[PDB]
Design a binder for this molecule. Structure first.
Ligand SMILES: O=C1O[C@H]([C@H](O)CO)C(O)=C1O
Ligand SMILES: O=C1O[C@H]([C@H](O)CO)C(O)=C1O
Lengths: 331, 331
């Protein structure tokens, strides 16, 4: 089986570990977990049936049993954890956004590349059957020549502690806009924008509150998005061309419905687990299965979120938040 | 009754005349119609039961029986028709967009102002019960402090002859974006934007094809919109604040449903006429009734679309299409 080590024990790691533990046991095994102290780790390992527990990430890196490491840490803690794993020769699936700015990304990608090791950013949305069907509709030319993409993701997350935390690199862009940028990049072939324009405001805790972005893409098509940590939005994403519109319905960041020219299609989630910390958390299986296929084919990166695109998405996000003045220590 | 003269006999005038002829006869009477030749006018007057017919607009202006003139002409023909009516002392309800650029608007408004005569731009959307309810929700502070507005309107109109005509000032902005700009202006108190950013492409017939616009509004709120004459869009409009979202569902330019924080409300159209040339064409009654109330109170303009706002909407639209290079003779 693909032998997984789980790095950090917070909410996202529960979901992921839970999902992995529903997969065929000859395909995936969770063999270790690491926390910043032994008790947090041992408690996690009992709760989730993981044979080995560690009180540092460095120990999980060095475990010769682990083949791939899932980096579930908070935003500013990804880079050092990813770097430890790559140095020790582990493949890495790293939670989103991979790093807090472009240089963190470039640095992870250069390490992976130079060690000949697999690295992927866990933009789980891309592997949903509804997103795959959207790509197919684009490939088939069903919407005609493209014209415009649109995506939005906002909620009041002001009582979600880490979502509005300057020290944890929270804010609309890094929690929610990442989904918008990836959607728009996906529909326009992962191409680099020709021009970006941004408006938004800050939130009184030191992060961005609501931000809208206009991206000029090549070939005379553009997209825009709005994200927010205070204002509910429609949370859908569409792309349109001369023959019609395709739209991922709410929740667009883990979508189960695609409407293409009025025609609805539903793509049911796996039945298990229920009671995930995050809405639709069972859809994490799609990316876990994806990591195994890439590794089985000997790929050092995913064709669906290639590292050069992770770098561009990070360029875009950082340019966006710089245009409205929002900075972190790491810059 | 309020005695109406109808200027021009095309599709929009049928709808409007049809609507006026469903209203209480002690409240509204259609007493004349004018076309660019007598036969077009006489045929219209038989079809619609209008006692007097004219083969020029100048003759309808000078008719002492007409109190208010409805200017239903194509975009570039509004200004001269409005000016004739004002000179002859008629109140005027002028179809949208009032003029093709800001100067045409300024010039109509200055004439009306100086003659002490009522002028209103027929932005019919504003008088729909669903839009009025949206204003009330804004006034009541139901959504919390505002953050962002969004609106979109596109369809493939490339086989609608006048919609894509350079000579008739067609294009996405002047046919469809006008609805977006007015929606966004409405939700932000008719205030003048601090900054605008535009991306879009042209259409091979000489007009704009698809255009997205970002508008920075005061008090740290912004809106954006996308309009198109080739690409179907979701055709909804929303505004959101710290406590939730309000949204006018498709068709947003003549809306009958309002969703406010998940709660749906429907506002049925008048039962008559059916078979309007344009979708939901019966909602034109709301503005006809509005014109009569203003005139009855002796108003020289509408408090709901004040002329100073018509001027700003025209400033905005012209700035938008100049940013992407689209020009008409009149500029
Ligand atoms: O629990 C949820 O997951 C999302 C996260 O914010 C995105 O990972 C959200 O807002 C939920 O309902
Ligand atoms: O007939 C219609 O009215 C609209 C117009 O384009 C707007 O007045 C539209 O696209 C229809 O369905």
């Amino acid at each position: 089986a693909l032998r997984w080590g789980i790095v950090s024990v917070g909410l996202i790691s529960s979901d992921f570990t839970a999902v992995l533990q529903t997969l065929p046991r000859s395909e995936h095994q969770v063999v270790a977990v690491a926390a910043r102290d032994l008790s947090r780790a041992k408690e996690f390992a009992q709760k989730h049936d993981i044979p080995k527990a560690y009180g540092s990430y460095e120990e999980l890196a060095k475990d010769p049993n682990v083949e791939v490491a899932y980096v579930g840490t908070q935003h500013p803690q990804h880079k050092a954890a990813v770097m430890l794993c790559l140095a020790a020769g582990k493949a890495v699936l790293c939670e989103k956004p991979m790093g807090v700015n472009a240089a963190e990304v470039r640095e992870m990608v250069t390490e992976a590349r130079s060690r000949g090791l697999f690295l992927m950013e866990a933009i789980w949305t891309r592997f949903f059957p509804a997103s795959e069907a959207l790509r197919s509709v684009l490939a088939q030319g069903t919407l005609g020549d493209l014209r415009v993409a649109r995506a939005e993701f906002g909620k009041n997350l002001t009582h979600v502690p880490r979502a509005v935390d300057w020290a944890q690199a929270g804010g609309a862009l890094l929690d929610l806009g990442i989904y918008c940028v990836q959607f728009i990049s996906m529909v326009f072939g992962g191409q680099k924008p020709e021009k970006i324009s941004v408006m938004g405001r800050r939130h009184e805790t030191g992060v961005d509150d609501t931000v809208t972005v206009l991206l000029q893409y090549p070939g005379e098509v553009h997209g825009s998005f709005t994200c927010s940590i205070t204002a509910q939005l429609s949370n859908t994403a569409s792309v349109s061309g001369t023959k019609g519109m395709a739209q991922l319905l709410n929740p667009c960041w883990c979508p189960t419905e695609l409407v293409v020219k009025g025609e609805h299609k539903e793509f049911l989630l796996p039945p298990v687990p229920k009671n995930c910390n995050f809405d639709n958390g069972a859809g994490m299986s799609y990316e876990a299965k994806h990591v195994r296929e890439c590794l089985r084919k000997g790929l050092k990166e995913s064709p669906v979120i290639p590292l050069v695109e992770s770098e561009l998405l990070a360029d875009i996000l950082e340019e966006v938040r710089r245009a409205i003045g929002v900075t972190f220590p790491q810059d």
